[model samples]
Target chain A: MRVVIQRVKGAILSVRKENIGENEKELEIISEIKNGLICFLGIHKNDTWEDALYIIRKCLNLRLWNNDNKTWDKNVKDLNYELLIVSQFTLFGNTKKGNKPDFHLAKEPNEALIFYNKIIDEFKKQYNDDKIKIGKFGNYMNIDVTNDGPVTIYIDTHD
Target chain B: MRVVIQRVKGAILSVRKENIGENEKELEIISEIKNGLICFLGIHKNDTWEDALYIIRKCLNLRLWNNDNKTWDKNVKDLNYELLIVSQFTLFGNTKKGNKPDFHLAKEPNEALIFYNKIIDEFKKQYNDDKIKIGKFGNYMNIDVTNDGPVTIYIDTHDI
Candidate 1:
């Protein structure tokens, strides 16, 4: 599994109410994370629940957010940290071979869907989140994130 | 440099009209590509115009689409192939260090802007386009593609 963890002071994720050719109607999810993470999770072909747990644990434990004094001195658990997780398979896009990136390493939609749910479950199971918002899977989403200190990090299961 | 190529029957690339935080006022560029390629070009730190032109020539010459008879026959040159070019620096993101896919390998925004425009100019200098659609350089965009056969391919100058 691969995750793009963006430490945000606040994040607002919105998607079209109707998923179709008409990309018009807009509705915003409860984007109230005062200071937290906007993570993009990508499921690989061989990723299991273990990989999912690894990503969730790291996001929760990493000392990324700063305390009220702004001293590089607070973890997500220390504050009212909220999570905005999005699913994107293109994170695994590799163009080392040719002009187009090969997505064979990415898990199929069905398998990925299962893992995404599992990830959500594992996250809810472990972390003590005031809230954990999910981006509608397989939808073209619009996310507005005020990056705190502009802190963006990436973590793979192996690392 | 890295480029993502998608062969589509028709596609739409739209962005919010107001660039503020509201994320409202949907203004679409009316980007309509015929049976052709919708390519997202990613500029690498080490790439130049030559790399950009190389990809353009490849996209123009490569036989990606099919003929009316359901056969692997036609190339971009043989059809009314249009181009939808978008700039995405994240195409070069990698996670080798500690998890953050370092975009340090991707070209900086200033240079990337130069190369992206140069690519558009170079493309016009070489190919014939009734219209060459472009995506908003850095704004959040929504792309909808009706993939013809869902045919996608990739290429790199270093591969040669």
Candidate 2:
């Protein structure tokens, strides 16, 4: 599993219109969060439950925030902040082949969705259910994010 | 050199107050852009101008957007989009050692800032000056990024 975690002040996630329209295809807001982290999670084809667990532990426990005197002293949970976990297979896009990306290492959609949901459930179990928000799985999404500190962190469980 | 590029509908970059305040510090907007890309760029300790050039070329030419029918057919310049380049040393944070990330591999601040400004100048020269936006080089920044497609692309010039 590979994840791109971004620290954000707020985030609004919307899904593309399901019903077709001539020229007005509006996205409907699905999930929104204030002051948190937005995790772009990519499930690897060979990822196991252990891999999933590692990501979960890090996402919840990693100290990405500052305390008055101590920098990087507060975790998301420590501050009672939210987490918007997004399913992103694009993280595994193999761009070395060409300018265009090829996703040969990403997990298959169906199986990946299953694993993704399991991870979500675990997130809720470990953290507060209300604190854990998610975007629609396997659907086109538009997200408005206010990146606090503009901080970005990458983690590959394989490493 | 490593960069995490996110396709954005818009971006607003602000810097923290240089003058001290009593719980009322305001972030002053320094740069902003619409319908473009926001690149979180990390300068490696051993990076050369070659690495910077590779990143510049990719950031300018990478086809990340979709056309009417053809997906991933339009590069940023093709659509007359903009790019907000921000210096971020945290990308080289060595988390494998422990949860508290170490930045031993990141370039020195003074040297990296110089390289970063040079890269920004090159970006403006390669693309349009009005289109290439940037944040305060070595200051604390608060960025509001409306992530379109929520599409993200990561590249490490060392690989090339």
Candidate 3:
């Protein structure tokens, strides 16, 4: 699994919703978080449960915040912050062969969905259930992210 | 140099400004883009001009969009799309020793800001100036990004 973890002050995730009688579509807020990390998770074709465990432990433990006297002294859990986990297969996109990216290494959508859901469950089990927020799987998402410190962390379990 | 490039349908970047008399803070939109990429760029402590060139070349040339039923066949320049480049030094956050990430690998803020501006100018020289968007360096940014395909591409020029 490959994940892009971005430290955020806040985030508001929205998705398009179709009204029953109206032909027009509107966006609805699906998930929101304050002072946390947004993890864009990409499941590899050969990813296992262990890979998921590694990502979960790191996401919850990684200290990207500063303390009173020392920098990078606080983790998200220590501050009781939230997490927004998003499924993004495009992290596995390969551009070596050509300019156009190829995503053959990404797990299939169906299988990857199950894997992603399991990981979310594990996240709730490890952290607080209310702290673990998510975007709509296999749907378009519009995210308003307030990037604090503009910190970004990348983790590839395959590596 | 390190960059986390995300394919975005659109993006709006805003920065907080203190009001004169209201004793309040307001967000003012500084830059916006439609149907392009939002690159979170991180300049490493040891980065050189060569590293900047590699990132600039790849960001302009990499094909993340599809065209004519061909997936990932069109580059940003090919579509005349925009690019919102933001400086993010946390890409070099090293967490190898403990849970606390150390950013010694990241370039210093003042120096990195100068380097980042140079890269932006280079990006305009390589591509269209109007198409290249940027955020306020060394400031907190509120970005509303519509991530298309949620496609992400990570590049660390030091690897090459």
Candidate 4:
């Protein structure tokens, strides 16, 4: 499992008019006006549905105490804030010693699309909110993000 | 390297009055003002300073495009923020399919402490800023954080 943890001040995702998915585009429309964090998950070719589920659970359940020191921890479901998930295979790019990183390890496009849709489906099932904003699977997108916490850390399942 | 990234909304680091390291008694001073995130790196016994340096350099140089569509982005050097680094071997807790998580994979405290301090020393050398904070090596801490992004991803050298 690979993850890049960021604390975004606010973010928004907009798809080009040329590409649009079947679901109601209401979530995409609403993301523009809401204040919340956005997490981009990069699915590797070896990644499985279980990996997706692990992250989904972790992302939603990790407890970060609130200001009052009362442990007022909450998840995406507890708060009505918007969640924008983008399938980022480029995250798996390998740039160890060279300039151009290779993404040969990333999941095949078809497999990735399945995993991506599965994630979205899982989220919808868990929240019952059809409008959870999402970006187009393979289209060029414009992501506007202001990292709230200046700290961004890279995480992986294995060291 | 396995890293557990946390965003600390507020924190208070305390030490026994008698056991204060040097004149570090003012350690109890709490920054009522909220600040940037805290990144905890879990080092393996076999990891070396070279790996530490590489990861730190990456963290300091990574450029995630801003809302402005601008590139060649921000890093710890570019921003005025607080960084608190702690050695949390427990983050590697192996609670898989069991009631108790095994932490045998985590580095020993003695070795972990040495490496943790080394990382901090390197951090200071790379970017000398008073705002760069740290937690007591093995002390109890009360941390409150509002995870701004709810965001966590991985950066692997294996990708290369």
- Best model per lDDT: 2
lDDT of 4 by residue, B4-116 (tens): 43333333333333455664343343322244445667676577777788766654444322325653244445655556665555445443433233556667888888888
Q: DockQ (Cα-based) per candidate?
A: 0.07, 0.68, 0.58, 0.07
Considering the two chains of model 2, state its CAPRI-style docking category: medium
Model 4: TM-score, first chain: 0.77
Q: Can you tell me which runs of candidate 3 are displaced by over 4 Å?
A: A18-27, A67-70, B16-28, B109-111
Clashing pairs in 2: none
**Tens-place lDDT digits, model 3, residues B78-102:** 9999998998877787766779777
lDDT against the true structure, per candidate, is: 0.65, 0.88, 0.85, 0.54
Runs off by more than 4 Å, candidate 2: A19-24, B18-24
All candidates: CA RMSD (Å): 8.7, 2.0, 2.8, 9.6
lDDT of each residue in B1-160, candidate 2, tens digit only:
9898889999999987668667738779989999989998999999999999988888898788889999988899999999999988888887776667788999998899899999999998898988998888777788888888778877888766
Model 3, range A1-159, lDDT digits (tens) per residue? 888998877888888886777577888898998889999898999999999999999999997777788877788899999899999887777755677777888899998999999999999999999999998898877877766656789866876
- Give the CA lDDT, 0 to 100, for residue B156 in model 2: 82
Worst 10 residues of 2 chain B by lDDT: B17-26
Using all chains and alpha carbons, the TM-scores for the candidates as numbered come to 0.52, 0.94, 0.87, 0.52
Residue A43 Cα positional deviation in candidate 3, in Å, after optimal superposition: 1.0
Question: For model 3, what TM-score is found for chain B?
Answer: 0.94
Error of 4 at A93 (Å): 6.9
lDDT of 1 by residue, A1-159 (tens): 877665655655665567465676655563445567777777889997788877887777666544467744566666757887777776665644543445778899987898898888777767754467776677645555553323445556754
Q: Of all true interface contacts, what fraction is found in model 3?
A: 0.67
